[PDB]
Amino acid sequence: SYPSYDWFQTDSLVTIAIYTKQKDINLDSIIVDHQNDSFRAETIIKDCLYLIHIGLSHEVQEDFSVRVVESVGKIEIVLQKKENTSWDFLGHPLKNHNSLIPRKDTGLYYRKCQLISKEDVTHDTRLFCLMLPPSTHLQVPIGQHVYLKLPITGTEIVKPYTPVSGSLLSEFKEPVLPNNKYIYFLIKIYPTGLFTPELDRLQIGDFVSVSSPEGNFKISKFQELEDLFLLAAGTGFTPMVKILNYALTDIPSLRKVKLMFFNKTEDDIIWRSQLEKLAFKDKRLDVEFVLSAPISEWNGKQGHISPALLSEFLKRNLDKSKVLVCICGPVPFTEQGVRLLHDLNFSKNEIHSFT
Ligand SMILES: Cc1cc2nc3c(=O)[nH]c(=O)nc-3n(C[C@H](O)[C@H](O)[C@H](O)COP(=O)(O)OP(=O)(O)OC[C@H]3O[C@@H](n4cnc5c(N)ncnc54)[C@H](O)[C@@H]3O)c2cc1C
Numbered sequence: 001s002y003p004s005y006d007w008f009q010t011d012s013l014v015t016i017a018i019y020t021k022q023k024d025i026n027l028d029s030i031i032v033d034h035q036n037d038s039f040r041a042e043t044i045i046k047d048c049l050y051l052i053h054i055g056l057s058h059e060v061q062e063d064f065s066v067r068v069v070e071s072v073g074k075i076e077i078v079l080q081k082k083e084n085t086s087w088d089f090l091g092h093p094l095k096n097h098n099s100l101i102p103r104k105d106t107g108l109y110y111r112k113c114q115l116i117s118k119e120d121v122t123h124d125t126r127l128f129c130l131m132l133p134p135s136t137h138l139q140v141p142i143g144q145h146v147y148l149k150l151p152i153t154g155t156e157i158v159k160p161y162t163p164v165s166g167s168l169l170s171e172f173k174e175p176v177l178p179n180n181k182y183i184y185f186l187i188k189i190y191p192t193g194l195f196t197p198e199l200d201r202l203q204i205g206d207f208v209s210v211s212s213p214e215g216n217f218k219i220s221k222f223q224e225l226e227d228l229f230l231l232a233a234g235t236g237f238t239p240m241v242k243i244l245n246y247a248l249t250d251i252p253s254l255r256k257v258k259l260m261f262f263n264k265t266e267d268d269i270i271w272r273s274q275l276e277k278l279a280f281k282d283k284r285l286d287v288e289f290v291l292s293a294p295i296s297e298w299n300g301k302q303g304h305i306s307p308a309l310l311s312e313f314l315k316r317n318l319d320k321s322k323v324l325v326c327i328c329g330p331v332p333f334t335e336q337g338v339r340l341l342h343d344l345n346f347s348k349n350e351i352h353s354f355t
């Protein structure tokens with residue numbers, strides 16, 4: 001029972017219809033890129049990837065629409081004709097057109113996005129805001145990352161980053177939109193690094209290539225969840241951002257979220273003020289900061305991840321509940337953390353480690 005496609009036209013429009021044959025399909029399931037004379041749509045079908053890749057017979061405008069009929073898993077993509085005129089055929093298929101391939105065997109597709117804004121979050125961490133081109137449809141699911149790609153003398157260089165929400169606070173958060181064109185990143189700049197000093201030199205209005213998403217976090221791990229624990233070190237906070245927003249808005253069974261956020265100094269606590277205000281205005285969230293190397297006087301917890309620390313933080317409740325623990329940070333932090341979580345009697349299906 002394999003997916004397929006068709007197309008039709010009106011005086012001014014060209015519609016491509018993709019028949020996935022799947023329940024569960026939504027706007028995170030398809031990525032569309034197109035130019036004036038070519039068109040590419042990749043659709044997530046279970047563990048496989050269905051590609052339409054066509055050079056269009058006549059030119060189209062940049063703005064287009066995407067619509068999902070979830071009952072039957074039908075996706076319709078409506079392009080706008082430049083000139084209102086009848087097409088003889090859709091176009092010439094291009095590389096890998098109408099192919100169905102396991103995602104494990106697929107490669108990274110990129111398009112160019114524009115740097116819109118950059119704001120300092122800590123002394124070495126910025127919030128970057130990139131805008132997708134009008135001719136792209138791309139949503140990044142919770143828990144997944146994309147690759148950014150930049151040119152340097154003789155080659156291009158690539159690193160992965162985890163998109164975040166623009167804010168944790170409702171007064172600044174983007175509303176739920178039919179199509180976010182803006183992607184946010186929290187990125188730490190390493191003076192001795194290869195990629196991030198170059199990213200930090202990019203001017204407002206220049207362009208960065210962005211891949212399609214990657215990562216296996218299944219958001220179904222949040223069905224009926226009641227107690228969420230987040231373990232983050234440094235920039236390992238970034239996958240927690242969207243998870244935290246989701247925990248507080250789309251899990252009506254959620255009793256508690258608790259974040260334990262490990263950093264070196266007070267100056268390194270990304271979004272400290274936002275986290276503190278969020279926790280105060282919402283008793284479901286608890287936030288604790290652990291500093292491994294404080295500068296100033298610190299009447300708070302100190303150290304690195306330990307067996308003592310998670311014994312108290314994950315102390316067993318009196319009542320049984322559906323539980324999830326997410327951990328992200330430096331490899332040592334995550335390796336030591338998951339070892340400790342198995343020693344505390346948490347199952348594999350109760351732990352996700354981003355790595
Ligand atoms: C799935 C995924 C998601 C990520 N998401 C984000 C994100 O949202 N935000 C973010 O800021 N970063 C994220 N990272 C880290 C990020 O991808 C880059 O590794 C980071 O930006 C550094 O790249 P760089 O070229 O600037 O520095 P690099 O040149 O790679 O190194 C910078 C410095 O770090 C130290 N260092 C480098 N490699 C090692 C090593 N193997 N062992 C010990 N020390 C080392 C060295 O001092 C080096 O000078 C993510 C990584 C992964 C794998």
Ligand SMILES: NC(=O)c1ccc[n+]([C@@H]2O[C@H](COP(=O)([O-])OP(=O)(O)OC[C@H]3O[C@@H](n4cnc5c(N)ncnc54)[C@H](O)[C@@H]3O)[C@@H](O)[C@H]2O)c1
Pocket residue numbers: 145162188233234235236237238239262263264265268291292293303304305328329330331332333336354355
């Ligand atoms: N999806 C992902 O896999 C993903 C996403 C985001 C960030 N990351 C990774 O998270 C890491 C964050 O690096 P950073 O510069 O922000 O951290 P950092 O250097 O600021 O250190 C932050 C905290 O990490 C902990 N830590 C550091 N070294 C440790 C060790 N040897 N043992 C135990 N704990 C230790 C300490 O408590 C420290 O306070 C990066 O390596 C990045 O690649 C991964």
